[PDB]
Amino acid sequence: ATIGRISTGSKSLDKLLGGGIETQAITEVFGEFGSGKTQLAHTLAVMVQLPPEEGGLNGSVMWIDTENTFRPERIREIAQNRGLDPDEVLKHIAYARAFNSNHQMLLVQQAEDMIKELLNTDRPVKLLIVDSLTSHFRSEYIGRGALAERQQKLAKHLADLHRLANLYDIAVFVTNQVHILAHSATLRVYLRKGKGGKRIARLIDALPEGEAVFSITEKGIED
């Protein structure tokens, strides 16, 4: 099946990404606290709902939140300022809070049920966000022997997510607060804060050599 692309809202970042984040892939953004990862996630949750000629996939969203950082009013603001109805956009985001890493695993299994339900409707799920991917694993698996065990549990979780992306033609987008550990995302994007409120993105271990630059605005993110 053809790969779909979801615009991030920033032309600069879209170019770095070859047009946007891909379906049939896991895109992981990583960076320090406050680097813009969750604002990117909020923006993508709106952009995917746009028609394809505007950078979306006419798609629904599923969001798994591990840190209570999803903000419905921020979705509404981004939607309103990009021409979409805020209540419609919010209605098409299925939101769940993961209590711990085991509940996070169960929520990925439940996501498959809703993905199947919507698959052949006019707004199938096209984006699954996990924010943050690693936070529960980091708190629960700690100390001597935890590196191997945490990495194994993480890799299985990522395998489950890859299967949903590939079987159902969904973009999986995950955030990670950042060690020389192995990773298993399709594409890793390093985000950082820059001068004058800008954010800088670089592809890691990849594709375009260069850096994209964007801002956080009432439209979510943009150049």
Q: How far apart are the first and last CA of the chain?
A: 31
Residues 175/30, Cβ–Cβ less than 8 Å:
yes
Structure tokens at 139: 């708190």
113 to 43, 110, 142, 168: CA distances (angstroms): 25, 5, 32, 11
Resolution of the entry in angstroms:
1.2
Structure tokens at 213: 């630059």
Structure tokens at 149: 């065990």
Neighbours of 181 (CB within 10 A): 10
Residues 21/173, Cβ–Cβ less than 8 Å:
yes
Residues 6/17, Cβ–Cβ less than 8 Å:
no
Q: What whole-number distance in Å separates Cα of residue 156 and Cα of residue 154?
A: 5
| Gaps in the chain following residue numbers (C to N > 2.5 A) | 178, 206
Q: What whole-number distance in Å separates Cα of residue 205 and Cα of residue 2?
A: 24
21 to 18, 55, 160, 207: CA distances (angstroms): 8, 10, 19, 13
Q: What whole-number distance in Å separates Cα of residue 65 and Cα of residue 69?
A: 7
Report how this structure was experimentally obtained.
Answer: X-ray
Residues 39/31, Cβ–Cβ less than 8 Å:
no
Q: What whole-number distance in Å separates Cα of residue 147 and Cα of residue 170?
A: 30
Q: What whole-number distance in Å separates Cα of residue 208 and Cα of residue 72?
A: 34
Q: Kindly list the domain boundaries of the chain, sorted by start residue.
A: 1-223
Pairing of strands 171-177, 187-193: unpaired
Q: What whole-number distance in Å separates Cα of residue 5 and Cα of residue 194?
A: 26
Chain-centre distance for alpha carbon 50: 16
How many residues are recorded in the chain?
Answer: 223
